[PDB]
Amino acid sequence: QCGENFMDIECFMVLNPSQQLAIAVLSLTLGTFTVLENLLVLCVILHSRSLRCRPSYHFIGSLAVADLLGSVIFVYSFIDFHVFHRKDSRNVFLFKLGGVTASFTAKVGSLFLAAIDRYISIHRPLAYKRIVTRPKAVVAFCLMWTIAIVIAVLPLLGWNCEKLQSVCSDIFPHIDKTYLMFWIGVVSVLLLFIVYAYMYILWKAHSHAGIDCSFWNESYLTGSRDERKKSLLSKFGMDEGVTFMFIGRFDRGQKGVDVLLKAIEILSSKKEFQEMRFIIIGKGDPELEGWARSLEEKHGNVKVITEMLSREFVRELYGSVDFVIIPSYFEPFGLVALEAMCLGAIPIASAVGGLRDIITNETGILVKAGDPGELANAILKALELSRSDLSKFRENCKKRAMSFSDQARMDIELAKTLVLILVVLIICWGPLLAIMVYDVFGKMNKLIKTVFAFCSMLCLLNSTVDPIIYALRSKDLRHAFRSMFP
Ligand SMILES: CC(C)CCC[C@@H](C)[C@H]1CC[C@H]2[C@@H]3CC=C4C[C@@H](O)CC[C@]4(C)[C@H]3CC[C@]12C
Ligand SMILES: CC(C)CCC[C@@H](C)[C@H]1CC[C@H]2[C@@H]3CC=C4C[C@@H](O)CC[C@]4(C)[C@H]3CC[C@]12C
Ligand SMILES: CCCCCCC(C)(C)c1ccc([C@@H]2C[C@H](O)CC[C@H]2CCCO)c(O)c1
Ligand SMILES: Cc1ccc2c([C@@H](C[N+](=O)[O-])c3cccs3)c(-c3ccccc3)[nH]c2c1
Ligand SMILES: CCCCCCCC/C=C/CCCCCCCC(=O)OC[C@H](O)CO
Numbered sequence: 001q002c003g004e005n006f007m008d009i010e011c012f013m014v015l016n017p018s019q020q021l022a023i024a025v026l027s028l029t030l031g032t033f034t035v036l037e038n039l040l041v042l043c044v045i046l047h048s049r050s051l052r053c054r055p056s057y058h059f060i061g062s063l064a065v066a067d068l069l070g071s072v073i074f075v076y077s078f079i080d081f082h083v084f085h086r087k088d089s090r091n092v093f094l095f096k097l098g099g100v101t102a103s104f105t106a107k108v109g110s111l112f113l114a115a116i117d118r119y120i121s122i123h124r125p126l127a128y129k130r131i132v133t134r135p136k137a138v139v140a141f142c143l144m145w146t147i148a149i150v151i152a153v154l155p156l157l158g159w160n161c162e163k164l165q166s167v168c169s170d171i172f173p174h175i176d177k178t179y180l181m182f183w184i185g186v187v188s189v190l191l192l193f194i195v196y197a198y199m200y201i202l203w204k205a206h207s208h209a210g211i212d213c214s215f216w217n218e219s220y221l222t223g224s225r226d227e228r229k230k231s232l233l234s235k236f237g238m239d240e241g242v243t244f245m246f247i248g249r250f251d252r253g254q255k256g257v258d259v260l261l262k263a264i265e266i267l268s269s270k271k272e273f274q275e276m277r278f279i280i281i282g283k284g285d286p287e288l289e290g291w292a293r294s295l296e297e298k299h300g301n302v303k304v305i306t307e308m309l310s311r312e313f314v315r316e317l318y319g320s321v322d323f324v325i326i327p328s329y330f331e332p333f334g335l336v337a338l339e340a341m342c343l344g345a346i347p348i349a350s351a352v353g354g355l356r357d358i359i360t361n362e363t364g365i366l367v368k369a370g371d372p373g374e375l376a377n378a379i380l381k382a383l384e385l386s387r388s389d390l391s392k393f394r395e396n397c398k399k400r401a402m403s404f405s406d407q408a409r410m411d412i413e414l415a416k417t418l419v420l421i422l423v424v425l426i427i428c429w430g431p432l433l434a435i436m437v438y439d440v441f442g443k444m445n446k447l448i449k450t451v452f453a454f455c456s457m458l459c460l461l462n463s464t465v466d467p468i469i470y471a472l473r474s475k476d477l478r479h480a481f482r483s484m485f486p
């Protein structure tokens with residue numbers, strides 16, 4: 001009885017009473033879960049000055065409201081239509097459906113603003129607090145929400161199959177198929193780009209790395225800066241002098257123990273060598289490992305170490321030793337440099353990869369890789385600089401390391417919580433955006449109408465799992481909620 005383009009609204013009521021009771025109870029319990037969780041998310045954010053001031057939680061707050069407002073309007077209208085068989089006019093029905101559409105596109109746009117926010121953090125790292133001001137983020141969210149609702153109000157104002165005498169959708173009453181066409185594409189292109197963006201943010205974040213500062217904390221030093229040095233040197237060197245430590249492997253053309261072994265030889269003729277002391281550590285290529293051990297007893301002020309050392313034994317090594325040399329050819333992550341600066345060792349390093357990004361002029365001395373003579377000058381510039389008080393510089397490494405590590409470790413987490421929110425949105429709404437595309441070109445049998453009715457519950461699942469993501473993936477939410485509820 002419903003083959004007409006202007007079909008009766010009864011033919012969208014595609015569910016049988018046992019099916020309605022199941023969908024109803026599932027809608028109510030699932031919806032009740034979303035309500036309780038999302039108002040809890042908002043209350044934690046809204047009632048804390050330290051939270052609501054960050055545009056990161058304007059974004060979390062945005063998703064919370066987008067979930068809360070859309071799901072509540074949906075569950076009320078969805079089951080009122082299906083179980084109570086509501087017979088609302090074309091305007092009021094399109095008005096209720098509009099509230100559900102505005103809420104979803106607001107989430108795609110809230111995801112979109114976050115993608116832009118991270119994009120400019122990667123492309124212009126130095127200008128981020130000035131370009132993403134809190135007020136700029138507030139209005140960027142504000143208008144985004146308005147453009148969202150405007151798209152939702154177009155059918156109400158006349159873009160529908162009744163006012164236009166066009167073709168009606170078989171899923172959505174009164175809705176024009178051409179407006180349906182337009183709506184999928186607009187969120188499909190955003191969601192598609194957001195997918196590309198979020199993968200790029202996650203790749204770029206993993207290009208940097210940080211260390212656990214608990215293991216590499218200075219608090220574990222048991223002795224003064226000069227005395228803790230003397231004793232460790234006393235175990236072998238038994239003298240007081242500036243010490244240059246190396247901790248890597250003995251490959252040729254990678255970590256740069258080759259460049260170091262050539263360097264040390266040309267400092268040996270100089271008189272100032274006696275002030276210097278060196279400690280080489282690691283295991284590697286048999287041709288050059290003996291080269292170091294041929295030099296452990298030839299000059300006698302150097303301990304080369306071939307066997308491994310526990311990561312908790314070397315924390316005291318980094319703190320007492322005056323200098324660490326990183327003559328690497330490739331170092332996208334200066335993890336060894338980070339652990340040294342985190343214990344106060346001043347780093348002389350190659351200008352390669354992270355070493356260049358981490359160490360600046362105020363923290364250490366940078367030398368072109370592959371030139372051992374330039375390295376020989378580095379520890380000579382480190383000799384004339386060692387006599388003058390360099391504790392004013394020793395602490396530049398103390399805070400540069402602990403701050404660089406926390407920006408790299410942070411950015412990793414944002415990139416993870418982002419994609420977590422994305423994938424759950426895709427597998428919840430992907431099926432829904434597929435059944436509508438099957439409607440744009442095609443026809444809905446009574447079956448595809450029924451499964452889409454049952455599949456519409458996914459929008460309430462998505463709204464319920466999002467607060468769980470924030471709860472697990474945000475130590476800040478946790479401490480705020482924890483302090484509110486002892
Ligand atoms: C009308 C029915 C269906 C829903 C009622 C709840 C509405 C009115 C509530 C729920 C959550 C609320 C939002 C929660 C937080 C903020 C951020 C604040 O900086 C401005 C107000 C704003 C944006 C609120 C506006 C009103 C709001 C959207
Ligand atoms: C379909 C919907 C989701 C599209 C959303 C469009 C969003 C991403 C666009 C539309 C209007 C835009 C804003 C318009 C003007 C300004 C002021 C400017 O000084 C900074 C950028 C800012 C704040 C823009 C940010 C991005 C913005 C909010
Ligand atoms: C028009 C843009 C689509 C937005 C997706 C909304 C969603 C997929 C969640 C949805 C919306 C509406 C319905 C029901 C379809 C029935 O054909 C008629 C009654 C609708 C519920 C009342 C909406 O206020 C749905 O199953 C899924
Ligand atoms: C039952 C109900 C409650 C609220 C709404 C809204 C607005 C809120 N206000 O009352 O209009 C919003 C819903 C979600 C975010 S904003 C629309 C709406 C939105 C845009 C265009 C057309 C209609 N329909 C609704 C239906
Ligand atoms: C549920 C959806 C609503 C979301 C609203 C947020 C609710 C988060 C409350 C969480 C569990 C409490 C766990 C205890 C909190 C501390 C966890 C922690 O990691 O503490 C580490 C600490 O720094 C050690 O030094």
Ligand SMILES: CCCCCCCC/C=C\CCCCCCCC(=O)OC[C@H](O)CO
Binds near residue numbers: 052061065
């Ligand atoms: C129809 C409704 C449209 C939906 C729109 C959703 C936008 C909400 C986004 C985020 C919440 C983040 C919390 C923002 C609260 C900031 C309050 C604040 O910080 O006040 C400053 C003052 O200085 C304090 O002491």
